Write an enzyme that holds these catalytic residues in place. Structure first.
Site, PDB file in Angstrom:
ATOM      1  N   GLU A 169       0.912  -1.137   0.057  1.00  0.00           N
ATOM      2  CA  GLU A 169       0.051   0.018  -0.035  1.00  0.00           C
ATOM      3  C   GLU A 169       0.946   1.242   0.084  1.00  0.00           C
ATOM      4  O   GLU A 169       0.530   2.255   0.828  1.00  0.00           O
ATOM      5  CB  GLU A 169      -0.928   0.177   1.420  1.00  0.00           C
ATOM      6  CG  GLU A 169      -1.951  -1.303   1.086  1.00  0.00           C
ATOM      7  CD  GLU A 169      -3.249  -1.011   2.157  1.00  0.00           C
ATOM      8  OE1 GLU A 169      -3.048  -0.216   3.300  1.00  0.00           O
ATOM      9  OE2 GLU A 169      -3.937  -2.243   2.019  1.00  0.00           O
TER      10      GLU A 169
ATOM     11  N   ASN B   1       2.262  -5.359  -2.941  1.00  0.00           N
ATOM     12  CA  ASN B   1       0.964  -5.472  -2.925  1.00  0.00           C
ATOM     13  C   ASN B   1       0.183  -4.299  -2.694  1.00  0.00           C
ATOM     14  O   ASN B   1       0.628  -3.470  -1.973  1.00  0.00           O
ATOM     15  CB  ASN B   1       0.765  -6.523  -1.595  1.00  0.00           C
ATOM     16  CG  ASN B   1      -0.564  -7.136  -1.653  1.00  0.00           C
ATOM     17  OD1 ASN B   1      -1.020  -7.745  -2.482  1.00  0.00           O
ATOM     18  ND2 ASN B   1      -1.390  -6.742  -0.112  1.00  0.00           N
TER      19      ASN B   1
ATOM     20  N   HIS C 112     -10.017  -6.050  -3.111  1.00  0.00           N
ATOM     21  CA  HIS C 112     -11.294  -5.944  -2.424  1.00  0.00           C
ATOM     22  C   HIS C 112     -12.303  -5.150  -2.900  1.00  0.00           C
ATOM     23  O   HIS C 112     -12.189  -3.723  -3.225  1.00  0.00           O
ATOM     24  CB  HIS C 112     -10.819  -4.940  -1.120  1.00  0.00           C
ATOM     25  CG  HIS C 112      -9.822  -5.634  -0.111  1.00  0.00           C
ATOM     26  ND1 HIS C 112     -10.176  -6.966   0.699  1.00  0.00           N
ATOM     27  CD2 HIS C 112      -8.678  -5.632   0.292  1.00  0.00           C
ATOM     28  CE1 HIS C 112      -9.430  -7.346   1.219  1.00  0.00           C
ATOM     29  NE2 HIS C 112      -8.253  -6.526   1.112  1.00  0.00           N
TER      30      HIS C 112
ATOM     31  N   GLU D 193      -6.173 -10.835  -1.647  1.00  0.00           N
ATOM     32  CA  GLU D 193      -6.982 -10.526  -0.605  1.00  0.00           C
ATOM     33  C   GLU D 193      -8.653 -10.506  -0.941  1.00  0.00           C
ATOM     34  O   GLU D 193      -9.292  -9.646  -0.516  1.00  0.00           O
ATOM     35  CB  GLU D 193      -6.597  -9.245   0.303  1.00  0.00           C
ATOM     36  CG  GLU D 193      -5.255  -8.995   0.629  1.00  0.00           C
ATOM     37  CD  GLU D 193      -4.811  -7.809   1.199  1.00  0.00           C
ATOM     38  OE1 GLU D 193      -5.634  -6.980   1.957  1.00  0.00           O
ATOM     39  OE2 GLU D 193      -3.523  -7.648   1.543  1.00  0.00           O
TER      40      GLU D 193
ATOM     41  N   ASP E 184     -12.151 -10.284  -1.840  1.00  0.00           N
ATOM     42  CA  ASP E 184     -13.404 -10.238  -1.300  1.00  0.00           C
ATOM     43  C   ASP E 184     -14.436  -9.602  -2.073  1.00  0.00           C
ATOM     44  O   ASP E 184     -13.917  -8.409  -2.648  1.00  0.00           O
ATOM     45  CB  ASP E 184     -13.711 -10.103   0.302  1.00  0.00           C
ATOM     46  CG  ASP E 184     -12.712  -8.999   0.778  1.00  0.00           C
ATOM     47  OD1 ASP E 184     -12.518  -7.900   0.040  1.00  0.00           O
ATOM     48  OD2 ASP E 184     -12.575  -9.000   1.872  1.00  0.00           O
TER      49      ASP E 184
END
Ligand SMILES: *[C@@H]1O[C@H](CO)[C@@H](O)[C@H](O)[C@H]1NC(C)=O
Length: 319
Positions: A131, A172, A208, A238, A240
């Protein structure tokens, strides 16, 4: 048959899931997490972060990270190790320090070396830097960027590679899955690391997403290929897909198609090695506490029962 068997049948290395230590006391949860038809890989959701692993300077703590590794080992699952340098979940001593470039660099390098060496040979990949970008593609104003400048990123990767030269090193981030300034800036971090002479092996796309507002299979794939063109691998790290509550049959069906596209984009792109979902049951998703009015983001519901999104994933993987 399951997600991981189907993934591997299409050339992916794994389909996996994140987890966290308190969940490992739930027998039923652990039984499904341990089902290698569905999961070939595990990421620790919290116990390898800086606040967990180096709660005081030069004072490392691995028990909780090791407990996740032990479970993956018991199951023969791969590990992704997460995450070395990140602006969130820093211990007080990092955030509150009066630093110079030299003293923060020393602390960051010592962190990376210690943690990576501890897990040498145990991880498929590391999320080395997490990030680092703002949405417009400028660098996030973390303590690392303010004190060290952009060189913190390549220095971090070079440090990691020196401690474990076989593990895949990943950058990432989120919102780098769709075309835009942020994804372009993520490509530019790959280029910057290599120009410095440091090693980067992968780009981690957190994924996400939001039900009914998920990037299309076409644009996901254009983006994946944008990274693989650079001589790196890619993974969805990750995944979702959070829904605006309340849940409905129509939203669950939308959510299925949204997951289907993600899996299919990965299979479509040679060099996409895997998909990790950010936990697998709605009961333990991070989403409802952070994103007010959103939830139900995963392929199993809060009672550990498959949702339509499970079948979406299978369809996207051609199973
Ligand atoms: C910090 O030190 C490094 C390593 O010597 C150098 O690459 C970088 O430019 C320096 N940053 C600042 C802000 O002085």
């Amino acid at each position: 048959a399951g997600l991981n068997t189907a993934a591997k049948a299409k050339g992916l290395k794994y389909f996996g899931s994140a987890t966290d230590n308190p969940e490992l006391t739930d027998s039923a949860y652990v039984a499904q997490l341990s089902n290698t038809d569905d999961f070939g890989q595990i990421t620790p959701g919290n116990s390898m972060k800086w606040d967990a692993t180096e709660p005081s300077q030069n004072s490392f703590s691995f028990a909780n990270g090791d407990a996740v590794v032990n479970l993956a080992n018991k199951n023969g699952q791969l590990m992704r190790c997460h995450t070395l340098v990140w602006h969130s979940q820093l211990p007080n001593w990092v955030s509150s320090g009066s630093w110079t470039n030299a003293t923060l660099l020393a602390a960051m390098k010592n962190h990376i070396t210690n943690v990576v060496t501890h897990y040498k040979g145990k991880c498929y990949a590391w999320d080395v830097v997490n990030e680092a970008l703002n949405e417009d593609g400028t660098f996030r104003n973390s303590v690392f960027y303010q004190i060290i400048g952009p060189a913190y990123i390549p220095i971090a990767f070079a440090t990691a590679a020196a401690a474990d030269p076989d593990v895949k090193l990943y950058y990432n981030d989120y919102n780098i899955e769709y075309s835009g300034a942020k994804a372009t800036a993520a490509q530019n971090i790959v280029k910057m690391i290599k120009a410095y002479g440091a090693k980067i092996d992968g780009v981690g796309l957190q994924a996400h997403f939001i039900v009914g507002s998920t990037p299309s299979q076409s644009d996901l794939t254009t983006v994946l290929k944008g990274y693989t063109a650079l001589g790196v691998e890619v993974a969805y790290t990750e995944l979702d897909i959070r829904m605006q509550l309340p849940s409905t049959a129509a939203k669950l069906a939308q959510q299925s198609t949204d997951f289907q596209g993600v899996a299919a984009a990965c299979v479509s792109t040679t060099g996409c090695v895997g998909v990790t979902i950010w936990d697998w049951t709605d009961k333990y998703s991070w989403v409802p506490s952070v994103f007010q009015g959103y939830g139900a983001p995963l392929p199993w519901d809060e009672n550990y029962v498959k949702k339509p999104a499970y079948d979406g994933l299978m369809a996207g993987l051609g199973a």
